[PDB]
Amino acid sequence: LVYSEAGPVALWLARVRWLVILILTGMVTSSILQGFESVLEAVTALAFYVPVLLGTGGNTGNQSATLIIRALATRDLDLRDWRRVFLKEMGVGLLLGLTLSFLLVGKVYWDGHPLLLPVVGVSLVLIVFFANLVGAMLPFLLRRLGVDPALVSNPLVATLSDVTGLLIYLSVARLLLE
Amino acid sequence: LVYSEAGPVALWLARVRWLVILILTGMVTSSILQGFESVLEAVTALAFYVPVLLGTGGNTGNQSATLIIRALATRDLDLRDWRRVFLKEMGVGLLLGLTLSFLLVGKVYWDGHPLLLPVVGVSLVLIVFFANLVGAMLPFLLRRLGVDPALVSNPLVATLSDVTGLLIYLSVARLLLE
Ligand SMILES: CCCCCCCC/C=C/CCCCCCCC(=O)OC[C@H](O)CO
Ligand SMILES: CCCCCCCC/C=C\CCCCCCCC(=O)OC[C@H](O)CO
Ligand SMILES: [Ca+2]
Ligand SMILES: [Ca+2]
Ligand SMILES: [Ca+2]
Ligand SMILES: [Ca+2]
Numbered sequence: 091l092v093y094s095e096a097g098p099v100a101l102w103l104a105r106v107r108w109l110v111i112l113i114l115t116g117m118v119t120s121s122i123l124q125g126f127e128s129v130l131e132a133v134t135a136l137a138f139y140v141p142v143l144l145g146t147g148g149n150t151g152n153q154s155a156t157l158i159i160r161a162l163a164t165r166d167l168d169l170r171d172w173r174r175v176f177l178k179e180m181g182v183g184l185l186l187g188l189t190l191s192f193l194l195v196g197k198v199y200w201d202g203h204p205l206l207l208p209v210v211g212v213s214l215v216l217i218v219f220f221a222n223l224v225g226a227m228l229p230f231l232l233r234r235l236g237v238d239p240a241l242v243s244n245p246l247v248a249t250l251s252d253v254t255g256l257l258i259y260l261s262v263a264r265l266l267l268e
Numbered sequence: 269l270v271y272s273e274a275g276p277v278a279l280w281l282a283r284v285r286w287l288v289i290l291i292l293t294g295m296v297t298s299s300i301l302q303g304f305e306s307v308l309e310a311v312t313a314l315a316f317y318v319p320v321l322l323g324t325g326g327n328t329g330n331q332s333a334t335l336i337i338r339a340l341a342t343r344d345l346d347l348r349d350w351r352r353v354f355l356k357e358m359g360v361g362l363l364l365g366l367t368l369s370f371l372l373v374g375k376v377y378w379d380g381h382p383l384l385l386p387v388v389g390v391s392l393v394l395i396v397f398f399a400n401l402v403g404a405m406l407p408f409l410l411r412r413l414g415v416d417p418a419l420v421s422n423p424l425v426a427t428l429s430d431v432t433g434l435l436i437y438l439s440v441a442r443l444l445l446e
Contacts, residue, residue, distance in 0.1 A: 092344055093335055093336075093338070093339040093344055093345065094339065094344045094345060094349075097356075098356055098359035098360050098363065099363070101335075101356070101360045102359075102360050102363040102364060102367075105331055105335075105360070105364065106363075106364065106367055108331065109324070109327055109328060109331065109364060109367075109368060110367070110368070110371065112323075112324070112327045113320065113324050113327075113368050113371055113372065114371065116319070116320045116323050116324060116327075117320055117371075117372070117375045119319040119320055119323070120316045120317050120319070120320055120375065120379060121379070123315060123316040123319075124313070124316050124379060127312055130312055130315055131312050134305060134308055134309055135302075137301060137308055137315040137318070138298045138301040138302055138305075139298050140315070140318055140319065141294070141297035141298070141301070141318065141319075141322060141430050141434065142291065142294045142295055142297055142298055144319060145290075145291075145294045145297070145426065145427065145430055146287070146290070146291050146294060148423075148426060149287055149290045149291075149294075149423050149426070150287060152422055152423065153283055153286070153287065153423075157271050158271070160271070161270075161271040161272065166270060166271055166272045167271065167272060178275075178276055178279070181276035182276050182279045182280050182283070185276065185277070185280040185284075186280055186283065186284060186287060189280075189284055189287075189288070190287060190288065190291050193288065193291055193292065194291060194295070197295050197298065201298070201302070240334065241331070241334060244330055244422050245326075245327045245330060245331075248323065248326060248327070248426065249323060249327075252319050252323055256319065
């Protein structure tokens with residue numbers, strides 16, 4: 091509760107379960123990556139861009155969730171507006187996806203991996219598009235369920251976007267490279 | 269400003285630069301992975317655990333910062349309390365590191381990469397330990413610096429923990445595997 095009067099063991103016991111749920115969920119990514127071992131081995135450069143893609147997804151979603159949590163608190167939006175938020179946000183995500191995808195493809199050209207120009211460009215557009223929706227809809231789901239985002243919203247978006255982020259990336263990679 | 273009366277283009281134009289700043293910073297991770305291409309080549313399974321390790325780092329650090337941002341706002345702590353938070357938090361981080369390390373090491377055994385058991389296990393302890401300190405100190409650093417931690421920290425911790433997290437993991441990889 092009160093940090094100034096909490097000891098190491100006390101803080102450890104207060105924080106541990108939430109991180110443990112997050113890592114147990116987090117391990118699924120390693121299972122997904124093992125299933126794509128052949129493309130990873132065939133083209134080593136595929137591994138180079140996993141953090142940037144997943145990270146850009148998580149940034150997009152947490153920016154998205156932060157706006158929605160704000161609009162819900164100020165009663166600017168209500169829970170019935172999730173149909174409207176969804177339809178508008180898939181426009182914003184397309185725009186953000188193409189924009190950021192343009193930058194990252196330029197980095198792949200600089201690195202000189204022509205086989206990965208379509209793989210990365212397609213993936214980030216889809217990753218940003220989908221991570222944007224996940225961020226926008228979590229505040230609605232949590233509020234409908236009596237949960238306050240502060241502790242929960244940010245790592246939930248990050249972990250969701252990592253799994254859906256890999257699933258998109260390696261699938262596009264398996265398709266275009268094999 | 270107000271989400272309900274902003275259109276897709278307005279929403280994109282208002283969000284784009286911050287995401288663009290984040291991805292240009294994020295590209296450093298790909299350069300780092302390229303500098304370790306040989307260790308990536310030596311053991312394909314190394315790539316399998318990059319999202320989990322970096323993801324667990326970001327979770328730990330953002331949990332830590334949220335606690336500190338709370339204590340500073342409710343003024344249980346002020347900016348001068350930073351040495352004690354540091355000394356206390358390196359106890360909490362060690363405990364959190366050993367705990368999550370035990371879980372992730374168990375997953376590496378399940379995946380059947382005995383050769384990677386010490387590399388991953390050691391790396392997660394270091395990643396959790398340092399990311400926990402980073403989270404606790406940014407609210408102190410940001411406030412002393414005329415920045416409000418609340419608005420920026422969450423993607424800030426995520427990007428720091430990805431770079432430092434990659435640097436720890438791959439370095440441990442050459443030391444034990446090369
Ligand atoms: C003490 C340590 C406990 C942690 C150890 C966890 C064991 C694996 C389960 C992971 C659940 C989440 C990820 C989904 C798991 C997919 C399982 C898998 O990898 O199956 C491949 C296997 O080699 C075919 O027999
Ligand atoms: C595209 C299929 C969408 C359905 C998939 C659901 C899974 C989560 C996704 C969005 C909902 C987020 C949860 C928000 C809870 C909303 C409450 C609701 O349904 O509101 C409409 C209105 O109130 C009734 O009259
Ligand atoms: Ca290879
Ligand atoms: Ca992340
Ligand atoms: Ca190889
Ligand atoms: Ca070679």
